[PDB]
Write a protein that binds this ligand. Structure first.
Ligand SMILES: [Zn+2]
Lengths: 55, 62, 113, 62, 356, 135, 246
RNA sequence: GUCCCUACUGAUGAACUCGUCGCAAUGGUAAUUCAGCUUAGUACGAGAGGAACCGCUGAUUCAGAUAAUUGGUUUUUGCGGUUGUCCGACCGGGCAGUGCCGCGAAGCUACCAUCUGCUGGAUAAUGGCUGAACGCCUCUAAGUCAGAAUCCAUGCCAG
């Protein structure tokens, strides 16, 4: 936190930010969020896998 | 969409200005009118909101 | 998703099937059929009605002490996703199901001895 | 509320048709027609090349 | 009621007709417009919804879906129409050779006592060097027609129905020159065409059917009350309807043996409910699984056709991730997906000991 | 601003106009008498009705005399008539119950006795904050 | 630092957010404005999880936890639980509790050393909280309001309490906790502090209707921003508080 | 203190050999309002306050269907309990115009349940382009551009 840089909307090389990501990839009612993008598993390829629920 | 035979350019002589030239005066003028009509304010104040595309000069290329 | 169990009779309660009763004390009452709901509303004892798992367990019509039933229970502590873990779990579920079938066959044989 | 037959609503529908559904349905049709093609390819008078005659009224009988 | 569904009359035909195919342009690839199927029933599912902007976004929702038994249809003909100042006119039709007994039953009304003599001379026209005349008919279609349709019939003897008479209809070919469409149909002669070949998953379609009859019913139910504008008593039900925008959620292959299995439910089970569809039976063929309610009773003939207009909604551009399909009994309050699950839940029984 | 909630999905309405319900907060009111609902569409001979999460107008039939003085707005919290939630779950409560709220959506009381409807908690943040059991 | 934000158009950020010293939970809905302000304030220092519990957006009033653990009601589904587990590092322990008062964010306030609970919680829930959160659990009613999670917000630097709390009770709570406490309001006169504000040791998010005097009180008591200091309220800002909230 | 013809609404139908697949003259014609999200605490504003176009998601009414689920309905007189009387008693049953009660499939229903409701052209008020009448000027006289939930049609029902 003390090693961070304060966010400002005018700096050229600012942080990307999810607002900018959704504005680039559609809008507020069109962007589809990937809920598994931040999944921290053991093997990174196990993301986007259909976990069985009923057998 | 301009009529066939009318060329429109962003000319670098003055700022925020657009040149619309051609051979058919009717087509040129109608294209200018179409742009001016497409950019018109609604439900605002005419005396306070003063933005749009307007015909500034009329004449000949040569 | 999840497979629920009927509060009254214990049959598998699948999505859409049944009515859920929310009592004012804060506990939820999930039923699998209108039969179960109406029995609960007329306040009969599932421990007395003979077509219920409560009655059958009370009267010892089913096996209740076995590792094949200790292996499955509700989990309140999540485990991090692991493909080997889920696949091996599925195979273990198959093994457990057939072992349970054989044990229940033996139990009902012993009851009908 | 804008009517379902409003001109602005029709124009918005036209844009949506032309910029999303167009490409999506084009790809879908390409795949489907590929499958159709897979299943499908799974003297003039005396030969039929010259299309001749097989075997109330508009005019008054004379 | 609505003055748009009047003269409130019984449907003139049981099959139900398309009445409009989507407009055709040569730039698209060659394809067929419509298909046929038989209503088997309807069931319950759970879909992981991805509707950005909805409160059920990234949530599981329970939906009702209608199941249509769709055995592959057989192409047996090709019809060519011309444009005239009075409309479209069927210039000529050329059939296939070796027609089936079911389509010949369609042609006949008392099939049992009849000498089954339909299209025999036409087959002789193929075989006895009148193929010149047949090619002449094909070339007439090539050089004079503007729209081409293909004659196709269903397979009752695969559908679990007491009926034996099939159903013919013309499916319009779109996307190409008339020559390309003629070659396509001629090559499609004597070949089965599948529903996964005509449609596919995620696609909204239009369903043409005859909604169920209820006989002479008064105004209270006929219109919904407390000159043609005044509510009158008469026939209510058995009405031709074209219902639009129904999402195709799944196409099951019939021979898959795991039609009802999803990537979430690892149960090797098929679409047919435990005990069979009530009043219908089992679905052993290709089946179409579509959202919502659809006109028609069980085992009724149904027409499935492509949308007339390119879609304007995000519900038509969405993927459908299925979680599970209900296979419990429709004959009562069923709670078991499979007989194996029922046996495992209830244990072994007295008749089990007596038989074993 | 009319107290019509936004984004609410369809549910079966269980409390019509002229309906007596319990009061779930410690505001001192015991029962409420729904006389009007917000967002209703006037069609001939139909009595308007409201479901869990709808704002209504009610007169306190019994309770605190300060509250038995004016027509108060109220968000209805519990519904005895069964309704379906989009997860396919049909459910109902033991009684019909609501809480006194201002037109902005803020409660006069400080606590809610009994459980709260999930739709009401989602629709009104203050009820979600003053609720103890949410199902 | 103290920032003002709105979830969708609502000033109650505590209903839709849960901020701790090792993770942040954000309600999922429509746009990414709320997640984005939280991310711009926490640029990947700690994970942020877009989560739903029981198909609701009230995750802030439904979940309680600190940097050592997270507790969710029994109504939480296995999918949501697994989402939380995959999103959060293994150094945080997540559990579902079978409490009748399923409004966990309303019945529990917890800093990283102590927790204060609704007096009618079950004993088993008490040991579960004391074990998972790793805190000393005390039962108390704040300003005679039995929902501590709704009527008080706590951090390891301080704690802001219902505006109508007695001085004796405030002193007793301060002694029992170990941090400074101040009686203040959020969102221009709102008493629901927990529902209108989320705070950790270095970040607070309030509603957009939070006035300047009360935002300065928040920054001061929670030591957010330069010097801060709970004492400055009693020295530098008295005139402001007396003139504004007379 | 004076059951008939016809209109309308549906249903059959002779002759054109029976049948299958079609076309479409003409007639009918359908959707409606609100809200929420983003735009945006933005434009605008001293302050207090505070929009809109595109894009997205729901709800009211209306219309047409449908029954997976969930209620209701029971002559399934299907099963069980129970009152009075009777068949000598048990068992098994009759009678009480369906004795009474509980559950109850199937069918039927229900904005008490669920699904679906679609696009081109030409216009009015009006705003324009070129340009006479009238050596200025002028949207009009010749010519022409846009534009309303309007008009005519497609989609839809009948044939
Ligand atoms: Zn049950």
């Amino acid at each position: 936190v003390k090693n961070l840089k304060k966010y400002d909307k005018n700096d050229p090389n600012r942080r990307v930010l999810a607002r900018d990501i959704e504005e680039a990839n559609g809008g507020a009612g069109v962007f589809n969020v990937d809920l598994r993008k931040d999944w921290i598993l053991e093997n990174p390829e196990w993301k986007y896998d259909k976990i069985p629920e009923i057998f | 969409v301009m009529a066939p035979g009318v060329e429109v350019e962003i000319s670098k002589a003055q700022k925020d200005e657009l040149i619309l030239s051609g051979n058919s005066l009717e087509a040129v003028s109608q294209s200018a009118a179409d742009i001016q009509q497409i950019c018109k304010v609604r439900n605002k104040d005419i005396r306070k909101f003063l933005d749009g595309i307007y015909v500034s000069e009329k004449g000949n290329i040569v | 998703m999840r497979i629920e169990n009927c509060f009254f009779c214990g049959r598998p309660a699948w999505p859409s099937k049944g009515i859920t009763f929310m009592r004012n004390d804060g506990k939820a009452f999930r039923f699998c059929r209108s039969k179960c709901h109406k029995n609960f509303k007329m306040k009969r004892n599932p421990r007395k009605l003979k077509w219920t798992k409560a009655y059958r367990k009370n009267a010892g019509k089913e096996m209740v002490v076995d590792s094949t039933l200790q292996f499955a229970a509700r989990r309140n502590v999540p485990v991090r996703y692991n493909r080997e873990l889920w696949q091996k779990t599925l195979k273990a579920m198959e093994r457990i199901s057939e072992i349970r079938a054989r044990r229940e066959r033996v139990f009902y044989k012993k009851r009908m001895a | 509320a804008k009517s379902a037959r409003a001109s602005r609503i029709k124009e918005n529908h036209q844009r949506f048709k032309k910029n999303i559904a167009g490409p999506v349905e084009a790809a879908r049709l390409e795949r489907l027609s590929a499958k159709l093609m897979a299943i499908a390819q799974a003297s003039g008078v005396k030969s039929g090349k010259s299309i001749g005659r097989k075997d109330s009224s508009i005019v008054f009988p004379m | 009621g609505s003055l748009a569904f009047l003269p409130r009359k019984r449907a003139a035909r049981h099959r139900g007709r398309v009445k409009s195919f989507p407009k055709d342009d040569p730039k698209k690839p060659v394809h067929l417009t419509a298909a046929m199927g038989y209503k088997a029933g309807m069931t319950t599912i759970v879909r992981d919804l991805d509707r950005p902007g909805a409160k059920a976004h990234k949530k599981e929702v329970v939906e009702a879906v209608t199941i249509i038994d769709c055995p592959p249809m057989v192409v047996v003909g090709l019809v060519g129409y011309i444009e005239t100042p009075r409309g479209l006119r069927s210039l000529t039709t050329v059939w296939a050779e070796h027609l089936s007994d079911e389509v010949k039953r369609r042609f006949y009304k008392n099939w049992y006592k009849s000498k089954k003599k339909a299209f025999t001379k036409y087959a002789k026209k193929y075989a006895e060097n009148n193929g010149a005349s047949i090619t002449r008919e094909l070339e007439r279609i090539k050089k004079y027609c503007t729209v081409v349709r293909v004659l196709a019939h269903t397979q009752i003897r695969k559908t679990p129905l007491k009926q034996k008479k099939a159903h013919l209809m013309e499916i319009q070919i779109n996307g190409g020159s008339v020559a390309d469409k003629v070659e396509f149909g001629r090559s499609l002669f004597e070949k089965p065409v599948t529903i996964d070949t005509i449609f596919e998953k995620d696609e909204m379609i239009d369903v043409i059917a005859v909604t169920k009859g209820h006989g002479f019913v008064g105004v209270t139910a006929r219109w919904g009350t407390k000159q043609w504008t005044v509510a009158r008593a008469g026939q209510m039900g058995y009405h031709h309807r074209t219902s639009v925008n129904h999402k195709i959620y799944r196409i099951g292959k019939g021979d898959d043996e795991a039609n009802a299995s999803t990537e979430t439910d690892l149960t090797k089970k098929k679409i047919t409910p435990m005990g069979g569809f009530v009043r219908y039976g089992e679905v052993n063929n290709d089946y179409v699984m579509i959202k919502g309610s659809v006109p028609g009773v069980k085992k009724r003939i149904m027409t499935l056709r492509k949308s007339l207009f390119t879609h304007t909604s995000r519900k038509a551009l969405e993927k459908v991730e299925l979680k599970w399909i209900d296979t419990s009994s429709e004959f009562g309050h069923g709670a078991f997906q499979t007989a194996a699950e029922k046996k495992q839940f209830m244990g072994t029984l007295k008749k089990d000991l007596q038989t074993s | 601003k009319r107290g019509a909630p936004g984004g609410k999905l369809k549910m079966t309405l269980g409390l019509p106009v002229g309906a007596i319900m319990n009061c779930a907060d410690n505001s001192g009111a015991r029962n409420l008498y729904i006389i009007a609902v917000k967002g209703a569409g006037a069609r001939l001979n139909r009595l308007p009705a409201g479901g869990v999460g709808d704002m209504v107008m009610a007169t306190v039939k019994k309770g605190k005399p300060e509250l038995r003085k004016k027509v108060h707005p109220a968000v209805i919290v519990r519904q005895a008539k069964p309704w379906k939630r989009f997860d396919g779950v049909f459910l109902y409560f033991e009684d019909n119950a609501g809480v006194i709220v201002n037109p902005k959506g803020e409660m006069k009381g400080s606590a809610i006795t009994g459980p709260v409807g999930k739709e009401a908690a989602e629709l009104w943040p203050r009820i979600a904050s003053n609720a103890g059991v949410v199902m | 630092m103290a920032v003002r934000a709105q979830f969708e158009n609502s000033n109650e950020v505590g209903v839709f957010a849960t901020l701790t010293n090792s993770y942040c939970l954000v309600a999922l809905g429509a746009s990414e404005n709320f997640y984005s302000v939280f991310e711009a304030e926490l640029q990947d220092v700690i994970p942020i999880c877009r989560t739903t519990i029981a198909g609701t957006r009230i995750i802030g009033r439904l979940t309680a936890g600190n940097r050592k653990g997270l507790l969710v009601p029994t109504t939480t589904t296995d999918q949501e639980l697994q989402h939380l587990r995959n999103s959060l590092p293994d150094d945080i322990r997540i559990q579902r509790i079978e409490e009748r008062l399923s409004a966990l964010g309303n019945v529990i306030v917890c800093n990283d050393h102590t927790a204060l609970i609704h007096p009618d919680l079950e004993r088993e829930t008490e040991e579960i909280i004391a074990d998972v959160l790793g805190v000393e659990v005390f039962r108390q009613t704040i300003a005679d309001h039995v929902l501590v999670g709704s009527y008080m917000a706590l951090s390891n630097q301080g704690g802001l309490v219902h505006p109508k709390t007695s001085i004796q009770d405030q002193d007793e709570l301060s002694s029992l906790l170990g941090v400074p406490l101040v009686a203040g309001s959020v969102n221009r006169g709102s008493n629901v502090i927990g529902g209108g504000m989320v705070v950790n040791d270095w970040l607070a998010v309030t509603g957009l209707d939070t006035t300047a005097p009360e935002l300065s009180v928040i920054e001061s008591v929670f030591r957010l921003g330069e010097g801060a200091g709970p004492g400055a309220i009693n020295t530098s800002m008295k005139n402001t508080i007396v003139e504004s909230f007379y």
